[PDB]
Swiss-Prot record:
Comment block on domains: The second and third Ig-like C2-type (immunoglobulin-like) domains are sufficient for VEGFC binding.
Protein localization: Cell junction; Endoplasmic reticulum; Cell membrane
Coiled-coil residue windows: none
Subunit organization: Homodimer in the presence of bound dimeric VEGFA, VEGFC or VEGFD ligands; monomeric in the absence of bound ligands. Can also form heterodimers with FLT1/VEGFR1 and KDR/VEGFR2. Interacts (tyrosine phosphorylated) with LFYN, NCK1, PLCG1. Interacts (tyrosine-phosphorylated active form preferentially) with DAB2IP (via C2 domain and active form preferentially); the interaction occurs at the late phase of VEGFA response and inhibits KDR/VEGFR2 activity. Interacts with SHBSH2D2A/TSAD, GRB2, MYOF, CBL and PDCD6.
Binding site for ATP: 30-38, 58
Domain of life of the native organism: Eukaryota
Processing and modification events after translation: N-glycosylated.
Name recorded for this polypeptide: Vascular endothelial growth factor receptor 2
Functional summary from the UniProt entry: Tyrosine-protein kinase that acts as a cell-surface receptor for VEGFA, VEGFC and VEGFD. Plays an essential role in the regulation of angiogenesis, vascular development, vascular permeability, and embryonic hematopoiesis. Promotes proliferation, survival, migration and differentiation of endothelial cells. Promotes reorganization of the actin cytoskeleton. Isoforms lacking a transmembrane domain, such as isoform 2 and isoform 3, may function as decoy receptors for VEGFA, VEGFC and/or VEGFD.
Parent sequence residues shown: 811 to 1168 of 1356
């Protein structure tokens, strides 16, 4: 019973969210996308009185039509409804007044998307830091990876509590901020899905096939439990340190049939046995038999305390 299916009836409280365009200094593009783009900006006093703050701004670009403008307004309304959590990109304000573009402003996440980050830090990884050598080196450890996994499950549990589902959960839609904080986001229109190899043609649409549950590919069913399936794929990207899923597999009709029958990915190179078992559990063929995000939160939190 998803709330994000009927956004047009959600409210936009201008008196709280509206940010004056003259207090926003636009900077360099962080994207670009197809019909949308994300831009780095400096917002004056958006969340603390008279304080400059770097922010990320989503807006449309040349090629967008009034239908993308309606879609970005629905996105702003769903961000307001969802609200704030440490592990979700938090909405700071918006510019919706006539005479300028619609702009959605969110907190800036310094290190960008998790997929690119883990791939760039693949060489700087040690399962456990051993004293004294590694003590002053900023290496990625098994603890960090379990911690990112835990934070994404916490953010997903929060989203599910708001009666929302993601539909495109993947490491490319996770951002990394300071103090090892990860935030779920959705680039949407600001990602060029027509240039991106993670999106495969399926009818008239470009879909993230490698992250979709069998009931999504075959029956077009999207639920919180299909997001659990994508979470399992996200765990594989994390413990492969940013590798692309199903390596060497041609993403065609045969791949979908093999998946539907119970064929799964082998363990990634940096996983622990229990993290691989968590992946298999997220990839149960029956959606009801997959763990919930609340169960994943408890399990990953226990694993984090056991890894210490
Ligand atoms: C302005 O809005 C966005 C900005 C984004 O990009 C970035 N945001 C922050 N910092 C960044 C730093 C970067 O490099 C340093 C960056 O390099 C490419 C992109 C950055 C990504 C997505 C959105 C909109 C969005 O998440 N909408 C949405 C709808 N539903 N939900 C639910 C909660 C899942 C989320």
């Amino acid at each position: 019973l998803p709330l994000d299916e009927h956004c047009e009836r959600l409210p936009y409280d201008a008196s709280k969210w509206e940010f004056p365009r003259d207090r926003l200094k636009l900077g360099k593009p962080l994207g670009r996308g197809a019909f949308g783009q994300v831009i780095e900006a400096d917002a004056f006093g958006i969340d603390k009185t008279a304080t400059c703050r770097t922010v990320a701004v989503k807006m449309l670009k040349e090629g967008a039509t009034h239908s993308e403008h309606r879609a970005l307004m629905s996105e702003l309304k769903i961000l307001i409804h969802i609200g704030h959590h440490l592990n979700v990109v938090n909405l700071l304000g918006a510019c919706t007044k006539p005479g300028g573009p619609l702009m959605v402003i969110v907190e800036f996440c310094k290190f960008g998307n998790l997929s690119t980050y883990l791939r760039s830090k693949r060489n700087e990884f040690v399962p456990y830091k051993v004293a004294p050598e590694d003590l002053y080196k900023d290496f990625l450890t098994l603890e960090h990876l379990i911690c990112y996994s835990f934070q994404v499950a916490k953010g997903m549990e929060f989203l599910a509590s708001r009666k929302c589902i993601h539909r495109d959960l993947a490491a490319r839609n996770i951002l990394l901020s300071e103090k090892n904080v990860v935030k779920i986001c959705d680039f949407g229109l600001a990602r060029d899905i027509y240039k991106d190899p993670d999106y495969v043609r399926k009818g008239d649409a470009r879909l993230p096939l490698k992250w979709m549950a069998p009931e999504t590919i075959f029956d077009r069913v999207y639920t919180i439990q299909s997001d659990v399936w994508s979470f399992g794929v996200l765990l594989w990207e994390i413990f492969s340190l940013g590798a692309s899923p199903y390596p060497g597999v041609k993403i065609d009709e045969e791949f979908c049939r093999r998946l539907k029958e119970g064929t799964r990915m082998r363990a990634p190179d940096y996983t622990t046995p229990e993290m691989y078992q968590t992946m298999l559990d997220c990839w149960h063929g029956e959606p009801s038999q997959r763990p919930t995000f609340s169960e994943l939160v408890e399990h990953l939190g226990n694993l984090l305390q056991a890894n210490a």
